[PDB]
Amino acid sequence: SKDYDELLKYYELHETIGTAKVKLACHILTGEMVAIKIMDKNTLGSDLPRIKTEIEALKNLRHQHICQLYHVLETANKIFMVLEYCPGGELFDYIISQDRLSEEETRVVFRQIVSAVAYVHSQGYAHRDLKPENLLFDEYHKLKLIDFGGSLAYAAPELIQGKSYLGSEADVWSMGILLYVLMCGFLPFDDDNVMALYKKIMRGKYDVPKWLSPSSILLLQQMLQVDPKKRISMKNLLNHPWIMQDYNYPVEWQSKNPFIHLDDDCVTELSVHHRNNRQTMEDLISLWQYDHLTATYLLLLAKKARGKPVRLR
Ligand SMILES: COc1cc(-c2cn[nH]c2)ccc1C(=O)Nc1ccc2c(c1)CC[NH2+]CC2
User: Fold this and answer.
1) Phi and psi torsions of 3, nearest 5°
2) Residue 81 contacts residue 69 (beta carbons within 8 Å)
3) Do 44 and 107 fall within a single domain?
4) 221 is in which domain, residue-wise?
5) Is 17 annotated as contributing to ligand binding?
């Protein structure tokens, strides 16, 4: 209860959804809805440093298809992460509701995944846990990547043997597994016992449904090469013929949300509320401490992108 004291001054809490717990909230000063992920420091033990270093990851990824981090609030025995409002549901449950998605809907949707994952690689990171439960929809049915971090059915085989791997190629395999699920509705390698499933991933043999097209079957063979050297590269995947079917342009992966230059109207509005001059506030925003100022600036930034006035209530 005391852990929420410092936080309830910045947000008003609403529903509860995911099970670490996630509760919907409203940031007071901007009126923008958010999602707050609540982790408990005493349960996870001391594997928070892997989560802390993944929180420092999200602090360095900003992308139209990455769920934005707004605010990290650390208390005595809880850690709070304030994130982007994604009300369109989860990609996993959506695939199950339609059984399978069309080749053209998956293509539209797979292109946002490649855009997200390509961007995180350009920054020197790798998601390493690509699966449909780690992809959210917003109101526009746009995809938002979450949970940077054992999920066996999506792990690359060199990750399986415990050998030395490149983070990028492991994601490429995971995207290949995930592309399969998008168009089929079931895993390419699946089994009740792990030892059989463990073995099936390294054999590389999957059954191909009759409904997957010739343009579809060979991209899966390119993405799910067991040997990483033969796996398709992100560069060649950004303009793959299948990726450019239906929409003939290479995937736009470069982010439209940098750190370097701050928004003027956002900064001026933050200055009149905090009663500071401009450069002083820019210096405090440039620190990017992911306190309440970073959250206010980021949510005030999003507020303008919508079309609302850049004003703090
Ligand atoms: C599980 O919910 C989330 C998790 C993360 C997240 C987890 N890790 N990183 C980010 C980020 C955002 C959300 C989110 O917006 N939740 C949400 C999900 C579904 C619905 C709503 C909100 C609106 C209420 N009506 C039902 C539909």
Assistant:
1) -65, -30
2) yes
3) no
4) 89-238
5) yes
